[PDB]
Amino acid sequence: TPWSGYLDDVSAKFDTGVDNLQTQVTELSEYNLYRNAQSNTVKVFKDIDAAIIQNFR
Amino acid sequence: NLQTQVTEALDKLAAKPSDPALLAAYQSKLSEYNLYRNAQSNTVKVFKDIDAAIIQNFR
Amino acid sequence: TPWSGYLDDVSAKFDTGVDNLQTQLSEYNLYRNAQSNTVKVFKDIDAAIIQNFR
Amino acid sequence: NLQTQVTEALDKLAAKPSDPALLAAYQSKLSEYNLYRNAQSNTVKVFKDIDAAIIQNFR
Amino acid sequence: NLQTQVTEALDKLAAKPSDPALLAAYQSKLSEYNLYRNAQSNTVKVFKDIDAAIIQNFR
Amino acid sequence: TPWSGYLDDVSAKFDTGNLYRNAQSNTVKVFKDIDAAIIQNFR
Amino acid sequence: TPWSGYLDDVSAKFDTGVDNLQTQVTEALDKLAAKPSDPALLAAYQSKLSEYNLYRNAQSNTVKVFKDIDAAIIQNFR
Amino acid sequence: TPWSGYLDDVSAKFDTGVLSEYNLYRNAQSNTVKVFKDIDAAIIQNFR
Amino acid sequence: NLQTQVTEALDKLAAKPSDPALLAAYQSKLSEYNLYRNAQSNTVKVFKDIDAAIIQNFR
Amino acid sequence: NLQTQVTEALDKLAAKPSDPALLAAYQSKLSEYNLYRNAQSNTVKVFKDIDAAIIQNFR
Amino acid sequence: TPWSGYLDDVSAKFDTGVLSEYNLYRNAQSNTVKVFKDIDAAIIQNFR
Amino acid sequence: YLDDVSAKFDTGVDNLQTQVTEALDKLAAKPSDPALLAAYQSKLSEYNLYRNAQSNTVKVFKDIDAAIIQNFR
Amino acid sequence: NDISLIALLAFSTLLPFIIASGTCFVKFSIVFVMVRNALGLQQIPSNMTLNGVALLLSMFVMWPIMHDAYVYFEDEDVTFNDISSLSKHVDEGLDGYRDYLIKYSDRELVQFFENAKPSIFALLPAY
Amino acid sequence: NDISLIALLAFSTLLPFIIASGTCFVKFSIVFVMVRNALGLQQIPSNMTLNGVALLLSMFVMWPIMHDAYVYF
Amino acid sequence: GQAVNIRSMETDIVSLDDRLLQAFSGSAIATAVDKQTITNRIEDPNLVTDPKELAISQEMISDYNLYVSMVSTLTRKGVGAVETLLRS
Amino acid sequence: IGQAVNIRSMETDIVSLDDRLLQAFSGSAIATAVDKQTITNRIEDPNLVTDPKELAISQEMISDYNLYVSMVSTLTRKGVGAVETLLRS
Amino acid sequence: GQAVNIRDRLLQAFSGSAIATAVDKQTITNRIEDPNLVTDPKELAISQEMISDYNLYVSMVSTLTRKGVGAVETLLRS
Amino acid sequence: IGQAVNIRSMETDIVSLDDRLLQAFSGSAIATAVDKQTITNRIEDPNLVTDPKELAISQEMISDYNLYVSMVSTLTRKGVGAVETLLRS
Amino acid sequence: GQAVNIRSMETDIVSLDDRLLQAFSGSAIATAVDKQTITNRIEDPNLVTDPKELAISQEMISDYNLYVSMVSTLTRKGVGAVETLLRS
Amino acid sequence: DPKELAISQEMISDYNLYVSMVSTLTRKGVGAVETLLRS
Amino acid sequence: FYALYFEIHHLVASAALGFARVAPIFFFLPFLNSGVLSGAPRNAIIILVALGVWPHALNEAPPFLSVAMIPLVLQEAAVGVMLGCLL
Amino acid sequence: DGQAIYIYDASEMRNAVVSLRNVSLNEFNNFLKRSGLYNKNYPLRGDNRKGTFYVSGPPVYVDMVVNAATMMDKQN
Amino acid sequence: DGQAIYIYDASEMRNAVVSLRNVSLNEFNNFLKRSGLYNKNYPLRGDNRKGTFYVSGPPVYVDMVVNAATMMDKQN
């Protein structure tokens, strides 16, 4: 099956939340900060669970 | 029920990733959920450790 | 309930402290720089106690 | 079968290491596999440790 | 009573976020409360761990 | 063989599209940090 | 044999995904440094260095993410 | 009684020193306290 | 014989400590040697500990 | 006694925050005190750790 | 006597070595001391 | 051994520590030449790579020996 | 899975008392020293040895019922989704031992004890 | 200086086998088992307490010898 | 969809050993399913991402671990009491 | 958020040592049940865990809860260990 | 190209468990002397299992031998 | 900076044994009680925590308290174990 | 320069104690002057601003750290070897 | 040093196991003579 | 500094065979048996007596190394019970 | 079930209640009548066009209806 | 319940209270009346157009009302 996790759901929300922002920059600070906070938030979601997998044992 | 109001603020920033007031409130939300989750993770761990300490002492 | 907490209070303190700064550029730049700074401070000073629990 | 779609997304980024959507999806893949591998390591480890504790008790 | 004059300097910068002397005094306040809080957190921890070490020794 | 990147492609849209040298020299440093900070968020 | 590992796999996977960036930035360094005022040459090498900096940091931080998981296994050996 | 600390004192060396004279005045004053702030964060980590 | 081909790559970076390709390959060498050395140290350790457990059981 | 000649160069820059030679010497003082202070903190820590390790071994 | 380390000696090499001349003389000066700063700030984290 | 992994960087370059000193002797001699600023930035930036690639390899070799010694017990 | 290992380890711990009481070893080691007291010798042939010759004999005859315990329990057909059939499964595993105790114990004493097909826990002192 | 603590803890671990051999506890323990055996009593007076009463006299004599070691060291 | 089974089955016991044996089967069936349902939660890689279902899978380990550790040491004491009285 | 304290610690006579121990057990199980439900209601209210001042308070209630039950565990362990050596003799 | 080939009970038990611990010792020995297999994570995980069941095997036959010879002394002293 | 020292140690011959141990116990309990206050009021005083001159001293005293009480713990444990190995037999 | 004595002839000893006492006095004076010779290196300011002297003192810190723990576990194992014989 | 400490890492541990093995056999060795003399 | 650990480590191996030689004299003698001597200080005596009488030099390596060890113990016990029945 | 005759005793009857999302009860009953597994003695109790229902019978009939309902609703 | 007759003694009756969010009691009583699981001896006690009610009966009737009531709010 084509599999997607919750981290991918977060990154996909920046793809489905925009309508034509992926097309109209080809067709700039908007694309600067929209990709900035996307990586910063997926970094936070990368980190928040990683303390819990260590707290397993 | 914290995850509901987590899951209700990301989509309006997804539809408008240029509103300055919204990302300030969204960051104020998501760091607060960051403070909640590891607090629950650290607090169940001591309750495991002290319950394991009794059988390690009495074994 | 819609729960609000202390970081929501300190982030709204930047907005509700001024009257109409959100509706009326160098002022709003440093005003964001201090608003974004103080939440980086406040997310660290508690998280040191979070790792300092166990 | 996660390692298959791990080993299939690095090569298109290898051919094009400047696409902004692709390396964002690649990091969203690879950090998630990072979250998967130590989770499997930590979960087999406890199943070893509690099984070693029984022979430690009964020896 | 440190938290009082912590909670007393944020409101004048909130009402007037452009005075250069005030944000200098506000940053000079908040970093000192930053130095105080983790000092208290680090100092209770040693008193817990060394108290746990005695029962770890005598068990 | 002529290898291409997509930072080679955005130069190719600038060729095939003194202010031209000021628009391109800034947008090439837009990618130079956006795609550098994304891979710096690995660790 | 000159032996290769999995970390040499992923690093040379970047080096086979790219083809000529180790010498094409030298040819644009040949070009722009000859006459250092041409607008079609300033952006030429400035378009070569940008992909060289992104590609070299991409081949670097991947190494650390593929390191620390294998550190976590060997830490979980005992 | 308002308590004073050392970061107040080093900023009290700076505040009594007095338009480009006033805006290069907040230039170095931002630098000195931000560089003085991290010198003890390592040591205060270094109790444990 | 891994330490030989470790010790043959340090000298060209010593003569040229500014080549970007060489330090990338050197880090690709040295982190893999880091993964090799503690693996051998941790694996001899279990073969000692389980050998000590038999005489601990039978003493 | 380094902190004395730290505390003696800031006041003349306070009286003249536009002399270019003074902030060069002041930064050369204050960064050097930065290099001294973390050196003392880092050097007492190992002397604590190796002294704690022996009792950790012998307990 | 004032105690002069190596970074005091390199600032003494800038001072004792002697508008657009004098400003760029500081422009090269304010960065070289931060360069000498962080190189010894790289050894110091590697003690622990 | 640990002196030799340090000394391979002092042997691998001939006299770079003196080459930077004579360079900044020329910089304090005549601080107004563009080829002298560019030569100084090309000679100064090689040093921070040199000493941080001196201190990081001994840092990673330190914990490797620390992993060896602690697995005695 | 982990309940099977604690149950086998509990059998290895209890094994001296089961062979001391439950099996036919008591018929051997009693009547061996009965001959020594019949002859009148006190320390000849030094009953540490005579317990050995009583143990190899009692183990030689108990071992075939013990071999039945393997071939019933080392198989892979133990997965029963309902817990009562698995309970009756391990009831039928010990059925050869229970049948042996029934063969060698008196009838009415067992039903007096389980007055408190019969339980293995009740016939054990009656054997 | 640090390994003086190693010499102290290593002396500390081997302590009761020195009390098992070096001191005069060996005179009290033997004669107290002998006064139990000569009376014909086997188990009583429960020699776990007879080790204690034989130990307390030996400590009562050995204390001035061992006390000068602390003030000297 | 979901599905629960409302009817629980029961059987009569007459002796004392079967009361132990139904605890033996109830613990072997408890540990055999709880060794598996957290591994199926780990092997499904959508379940290893969300912190909500990470925190419930965090506490299911501690529920399994304290239970099997409790039944180990109670049985160690239970056979220790048969050990000492017969050694005397 | 508005509190109350009770000031009477009553005294009932013990009729035996067994009558004493039942009070000492019931007096300690209430304190260990209440403090753990205090720290849970502190956590489950999320506005208490986001403030800096209340966190060192919850740190203190954690470290006291760990030290209390560990001190009664090792003491009861050495107590029954003191019983076992005398009974072995 | 990869290839594949296809093919007193105490006196057979001790001989059966004799090389059963030897080949599992050696297969993780040349697993760890081969440096390609210790760098890959999913080869590290199956070696982590291969260590752990190795530990449970020789500890199980250790303690079960100990209680096996532990049942003879009490009956023999009687 | 205020210091004080007493120089002549009290010393005599007591054939009594327990009171020397009582003086050793009280001398250790008071010296470990005065310093837990001295480090605590150094840490709650907000002037001392900000000064880098005072901070170098503050890291020292927490190590001197740490190594001291851990030394008495390990010496006593070997001490009470040494009497255990002779009396348990 | 440095010195090496060439002939380490086995001076036969009446017991092993004089050898242990000379090894203990041979190394207590060693580590006592090391604990000074790196601390005074830190305490002089001219020694610590030079990176060249600084990584030398980093080196001697890594030697002094690795040394005492190599003597520590070696004697803890020696005591652990002798007590398992003497316990019996 | 990574190869020299590793070969001394085995060299300490195997000789420590050998000295414990030779001492446990001496204890069961003379203890078997003790019980056979009590017979 | 490896030989300092090896000198005590060759000794503790040499005393085990020294224990196996002189242990069944402490069972035979009337003023040294287990009826007259306790359990706790017995095994301290039997080790250091054989350490004071062991014939080879202590710092040297013992020649015991993997020759034939289980029958060597039955040699030293058989000569020990011989010396017991003569003494 | 068209192939064999299973016989249980009366104290082994188990029951369950399931909930379907995107498949109706009348369509599942038209599947059971299409296949032949429809049993008029132990029918399905629920509303005729809704999503939740109740089933009770022998343990081979209940585990069949549950395993085909939660694998048919996931496919649609 | 339409297929079997269950019998328990009087000391086994269970109680339960359950609050529905997006369905009424009069809409749930139609699910019990139309499907045939209605029982006039142990009805549902509550207000007719609300969410909260009270049940008490045999342990197979109580577990069916709770499990079939909390499975409708996930569908509506």
Q: B17: which residues sit within 8 A by CB, 6+ positions away?
A: A14, A17, A18, A21, A30, A33, A34, A37, B23
* Half-sphere exposure of residue U38: CA atoms within 13 angstroms, side-chain side: 27
Chain N and chain R touch, per 3+ beta carbon pairs within 8 A:
yes
| Ordered DSSP codes for H2-47 | ----HHHHHHHHHHTT--HHHHTHHHHHHHHHHHHHSTTHHHHHTT
| β-strand partners of W54 | W17, W45
- Partner residue opposite I32 with nearest CB, options G2, G5, G74: G5
Q: How many CB pairs under 8 A join N and U?
A: 25
Q: Tell if the CB–CB gap between D54 and M13 is shorter than 8 Å.
A: no
Which tokens sit at G2? Answer: 């000159």
What is the b/e burial string over H33-47, where b = at least 16 CB atoms within 10 angstroms of the residue's CB? beebbebbeebbebb
Answer whether U19's CB lies under 8 Å from U50's CB. yes
The type of residue at G50 is S
Alpha carbons T20 and U16: distance in angstroms, whole number: 9
The type of residue at U21 is R
Q: O14: which residues sit within 8 A by CB, 6+ positions away?
A: M114, M119
Alpha carbons D24 and F39: distance in angstroms, whole number: 9
Alpha carbons U28 and U45: distance in angstroms, whole number: 15
Three-state secondary structure call for residue V52: strand
- Test mutation, W71, W72, W73, chain O, max O CBs within 10 A: W71
**Which residue, among L3, F36, K39, G7, has the nearest Cα to I26 in the 3D structure?**
G7
**Which residue, among L73, D40, Q28, T5, has the nearest Cα to I39 in the 3D structure?**
Q28
- Partner residue opposite R52 with nearest CB, options J37, J51, J55: J37
State the pairing for strand pair V52-57/V45-46: antiparallel
Three-state secondary structure call for residue T31: helix
Tell me, in Å, the resolution of the deposited structure.
Answer: 3.8
Handedness of CA E34, E39, E40, E41 (dihedral sign): positive
The type of residue at S16 is L
Residues of M in contact with O18 (CB under 8 A): 87, 91, 119
Q: How is residue W52 annotated by DSSP? A: E
Alpha carbons C15 and V23: distance in angstroms, whole number: 51
Alpha carbons V18 and R48: distance in angstroms, whole number: 68
Q: D37: which residues sit within 8 A by CB, 6+ positions away?
A: G69, G72, G73, Q41, Q45
Answer whether G34's CB lies under 8 Å from G10's CB. no
Q: Assign residue M124 a region: left if phi > 0, alpha if psi is -120 to 50, beta otherwise?
A: alpha
- Partner residue opposite N15 with nearest CB, options R78, R87, R89: R78
Q: Tell if the CB–CB gap between K47 and S58 is shorter than 8 Å.
A: yes
Question: For tokens 């014909």, what's the residue?
Answer: N40
Q: Tell if the CB–CB gap between R46 and E2 is shorter than 8 Å.
A: yes
How distant is the Cα of N17 from the closest Cα of chain U, in angstroms?
Answer: 6
Answer whether I28's CB lies under 8 Å from G59's CB. no
Asked if U4 reaches chain S (Cβ–Cβ under 8 Å), the answer is yes
CA triplet A22, A23, A27: central angle to 5 degrees?
Answer: 135
Which tokens sit at G41? Answer: 């040459």
CA distances from J27 to J11, L54, M17, N63 (A): 13, 26, 83, 64
Subunits with 3+ Cβ pairs within 8 Å of M are: D, O, Q, T
Neighbours of G71 (CB within 10 A): 15
The three state secondary structure string of R29-66 is HHHHHHHHHHHHHHHHCCCCCCCHHHHHHHHHHHHHHH
Answer whether I5's CB lies under 8 Å from I36's CB. no
Q: Which residues of R touch N (CB under 8 A)?
A: 17, 74-75, 78-79, 81-83, 85-89
Q: How is residue A7 annotated by DSSP? A: H
Asked if S51 reaches chain J (Cβ–Cβ under 8 Å), the answer is no
**Which residue, among P19, R84, C50, C29, has the nearest Cα to P11 in the 3D structure?**
P19
Which tokens sit at T18? Answer: 């050998």
Q: Q29: which residues sit within 8 A by CB, 6+ positions away?
A: none
**Which residue, among O85, W25, M62, O82, has the nearest Cα to P88 in the 3D structure?**
O85
Instruction: Give G68: exposed, middle or buried? Use CB within 10 Å, 0-12, 13-18, 19+.
Output: middle
Answer whether O72's CB lies under 8 Å from M6's CB. yes
Which tokens sit at A30? Answer: 């908007």
Alpha carbons S18 and S3: distance in angstroms, whole number: 24
| β-strand partners of W52 | W19
Which tokens sit at O19? Answer: 């009361």
Asked if R9 reaches chain J (Cβ–Cβ under 8 Å), the answer is no
Q: Helices J20-58 and S51-87 meet at what angle, rounded to 10?
A: 10
Which tokens sit at N64? Answer: 């001035």
Alpha carbons A21 and G63: distance in angstroms, whole number: 32
Q: Tell if the CB–CB gap between B48 and O62 is shorter than 8 Å.
A: yes
Q: Tell if the CB–CB gap between D45 and A35 is shorter than 8 Å.
A: no
Alpha carbons J7 and A9: distance in angstroms, whole number: 55
The type of residue at V12 is E
| Ordered DSSP codes for G7-26 | HHHHHHHHHHHS-SHHHHHH
Instruction: Give Q12: exposed, middle or buried? Use CB within 10 Å, 0-12, 13-18, 19+.
Output: exposed
Q: Tell if the CB–CB gap between M52 and Q63 is shorter than 8 Å.
A: no
Answer whether W18's CB lies under 8 Å from W58's CB. no
Q: How is residue N67 annotated by DSSP? A: H
Is the N-terminal amide bond of N45 cis, ω within 30° of 0?
yes
Closest Cα in chain L to I7: L5
Q: Assign residue C52 a region: left if phi > 0, alpha if psi is -120 to 50, beta otherwise?
A: alpha
| β-strand partners of V45 | V54
Q: Tell if the CB–CB gap between Q32 and I39 is shorter than 8 Å.
A: yes
CA distances from S59 to K38, L17, L53, S65 (A): 19, 19, 14, 10
Q: Tell if the CB–CB gap between U38 and N21 is shorter than 8 Å.
A: no
Asked if U39 reaches chain R (Cβ–Cβ under 8 Å), the answer is yes
Three-state secondary structure call for residue W37: coil
Closest Cα in chain M to D51: M2
Which tokens sit at N12? Answer: 């500390």
List the beta strands (DSSP E) in W1-76: 14-19, 45-46, 52-57
**Which residue, among R48, J8, J10, has the nearest Cα to H5 in the 3D structure?**
R48
- Partner residue opposite M20 with nearest CB, options Q64, Q70, Q75: Q75
Answer whether D27's CB lies under 8 Å from F39's CB. yes
Answer whether V70's CB lies under 8 Å from O3's CB. yes
Three-state secondary structure call for residue V56: strand
Q: Tell if the CB–CB gap between M14 and O21 is shorter than 8 Å.
A: no
Q: How is residue V18 annotated by DSSP? A: E
Q: Tell if the CB–CB gap between R78 and N63 is shorter than 8 Å.
A: no
Residues of I in contact with L13 (CB under 8 A): 14-15, 17
Q: Tell if the CB–CB gap between S85 and T16 is shorter than 8 Å.
A: no
Alpha carbons V57 and U1: distance in angstroms, whole number: 81
Which tokens sit at R20? Answer: 């020397």
Subunits with 3+ Cβ pairs within 8 Å of T are: I, L, M, S, U
**Which residue, among A41, B34, E30, has the nearest Cα to C43 in the 3D structure?**
B34
The type of residue at P24 is A
Q: H15: which residues sit within 8 A by CB, 6+ positions away?
A: E21, E24
Answer whether W64's CB lies under 8 Å from W36's CB. no
W17 φ/ψ angles, rounded to the nearest 5 degrees = -130, 130
Question: What order of strands is seen across the sheet that includes strand W52-57?
Answer: W14-19, W52-57, W45-46
In chain P, what is the greatest distance between 2 CA atoms, to the nearest angstrom?
Answer: 59
Asked if N51 reaches chain R (Cβ–Cβ under 8 Å), the answer is yes
Neighbours of F41 (CB within 10 A): 16
Answer whether E32's CB lies under 8 Å from H7's CB. yes
Q: Tell if the CB–CB gap between A49 and O46 is shorter than 8 Å.
A: no
Is the N-terminal amide bond of M118 cis, ω within 30° of 0?
no
Q: How is residue D10 annotated by DSSP? A: H
Is the N-terminal amide bond of V58 cis, ω within 30° of 0?
no
The three state secondary structure string of chain S is CCCCCCCCCCCCCCCCHHHHHHHHHHHHHHHHHHHHHHHHHHHCHHHHHCHHHHHHHHHHHHHHHHHHHHHHHHHHHHHHHHHHHHHC
Q: Assign residue P4 a region: left if phi > 0, alpha if psi is -120 to 50, beta otherwise?
A: beta
Estimate to the nearest angstrom the gap between the alpha carbon of W61 and the chain centroid. 7
Handedness of CA J24, J29, J35, J41 (dihedral sign): negative
Q: T13: which residues sit within 8 A by CB, 6+ positions away?
A: I44, I48, L72
Alpha carbons E38 and H44: distance in angstroms, whole number: 8
| β-strand partners of W53 | W18, W46
Q: How many CB pairs under 8 A join D and O?
A: 27
Q: How is residue D19 annotated by DSSP? A: -
**Which residue, among W8, W7, W28, has the nearest Cα to W70 in the 3D structure?**
W28
CA triplet V65, V69, V72: central angle to 5 degrees?
Answer: 140
Alpha carbons M55 and M32: distance in angstroms, whole number: 11
Alpha carbons T24 and T30: distance in angstroms, whole number: 10
The type of residue at O31 is T
Alpha carbons F8 and D17: distance in angstroms, whole number: 11
The type of residue at C27 is E
Q: W7: which residues sit within 8 A by CB, 6+ positions away?
A: none
Q: How do the residues of chain M divide into helix, strand and coil, expressed in percent and rounded to 5?
A: 75, 0, 25
Answer whether I6's CB lies under 8 Å from I30's CB. yes
Alpha carbons U35 and U48: distance in angstroms, whole number: 21
